Design a binder for this molecule. Structure first.
Ligand SMILES: [Co+2]
Lengths: 52, 370
């Protein structure tokens, strides 16, 4: 069984990574319950992409 | 009784150890009684007797106004283009603190020093890191206030360097003076708005080859001052068609007047810096320790008077604007973000605090400068 050796790439260029770190973090959250976590738990709350 | 040094440092009370402070401009109330003049109360009848019953209250306004006069003369002495307003505000505040010899809430600054540039109108002071250099082609509204035992005096003027603005300055000054003389006892606020609009609109401004018409900022208006309460709940308008409420004996008023070469209305443009605890709200629960701590700090140090973020950083408090907006949502403190007109417009303001004495009308904030 021979490994495929294409005469040409079917896709001209690799697809760009459209889900990057700036896409990972949407924005921080500022609700009242959140503030408790930064003070007492040393934890940050974030809204992130659903696919991350 | 000593004298004041060239850089003002002697407290006002030291200049008048006797206890009596220089009186403002005494003016007879307008002859709005259908021609009959009000020059019947100046005689020392029971009117003057009950005027004397509140003499000690007036003296506080007199010393506060004198301190304001010296502070603004000092500011006029050294103000020049090219220096940022962070150090300008620091100099104004420290000079006012030394002249008023603040001690807790018995004496101190009534509200943060507002220095609005160009289209901005009021309630702007630089925050930490605000790098704004002044320019030759700038106009600035220096609004600051001092108080003695809560007797607040509010005064404001406009500084210019390019001589192309003198027409607008004189228009706004004439409007403010007309509002001053029009005010009186038992007169409707709509009348003072009528007078201000009818004096101020009859001026034309020629700036940079473009002819503009100066118009009042219908959004802003004057206000009444109370004991530790800058806004007593009565607003004197500067445009036609207002309320029909009267002004009564024993009240004090800040007759503000704004003029713009723009649209005559303002909105919130940049970051808020002025804040004010509500005089009417009572006890509202808080759930954040930081928020509670900031609340008690501000009510101990600023009470019901207005404050700015510079005054909180000056106290060593950091990481606080969070709990500050938390108090804002809880309704304890109301933010007062800067009010600005259309970009490229210019605004001028002149303000004076007036006293409704039983026998006469004293404009305590009057000075030789304006
Ligand atoms: Co005011």
């Amino acid at each position: 069984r021979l490994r495929r050796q294409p005469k040409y790439p079917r896709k001209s260029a690799p697809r760009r990574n459209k889900l990057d770190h700036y896409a990972i973090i949407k924005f921080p959250l500022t609700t009242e319950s959140a503030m408790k976590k930064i003070e007492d738990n040393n934890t940050l709350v974030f809204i992130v992409d659903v696919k991350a | 009784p000593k004298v004041q040094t060239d850089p003002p440092s002697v407290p006002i009370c030291d200049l008048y150890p006797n206890g009596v402070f220089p009186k403002g401009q005494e003016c007879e109330y307008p002859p709005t009684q259908d021609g009959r003049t009000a020059a019947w109360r100046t005689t020392s009848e029971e009117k003057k007797a009950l005027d004397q019953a509140s003499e000690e209250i007036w003296n506080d306004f007199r010393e506060a106004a004198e301190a304001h006069r010296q502070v603004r003369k000092y500011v006029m002495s050294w103000i020049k283009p090219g220096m940022t307003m962070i150090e300008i505000c620091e100099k104004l505040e420290d000079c006012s603190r030394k002249l008023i010899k603040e001690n807790g809430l018995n004496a101190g600054l009534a509200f943060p020093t507002g220095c609005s540039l160009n289209n901005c109108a009021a309630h702007y002071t630089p925050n930490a890191g605000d790098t704004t250099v002044l320019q030759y082609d700038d106009i600035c509204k220096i609004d600051f206030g001092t108080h003695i035992s809560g007797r607040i005096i509010d005064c404001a003027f406009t500084v210019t360097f390019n001589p192309k603005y003198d027409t607008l300055l004189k228009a706004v000054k004439d409007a403010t003076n007309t509002g001053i003389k029009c005010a009186g006892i038992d007169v409707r606020l709509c009348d003072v708005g009528e007078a201000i609009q009818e004096v101020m609109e009859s001026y034309e401004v020629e700036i940079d080859g473009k002819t503009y018409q100066v118009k009042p900022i219908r959004n802003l208006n004057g206000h009444s001052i109370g004991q530790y309460r800058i806004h007593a709940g009565k607003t004197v308008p500067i445009v036609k068609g207002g309320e029909a409420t009267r002004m009564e004996e024993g009240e004090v008023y800040a007759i503000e007047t704004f003029g713009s070469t723009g649209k005559g209305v303002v909105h919130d443009d940049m970051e808020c810096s002025h804040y004010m605890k509500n005089f009417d709200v009572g006890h509202v629960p808080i759930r954040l320790p930081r928020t509670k701590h900031l609340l008690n700090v501000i009510n101990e140090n600023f009470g019901t008077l207005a404050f700015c973020r510079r005054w909180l950083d000056r106290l060593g408090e950091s990481k606080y604007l969070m709990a500050l907006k938390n108090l804002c949502d809880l309704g304890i403190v109301d933010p007062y973000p800067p009010l600005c007109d259309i970009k490229g417009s210019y605004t001028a303001q002149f303000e004076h605090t007036i006293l409704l004495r039983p026998t006469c009308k004293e404009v305590v904030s009057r000075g030789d400068d304006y």
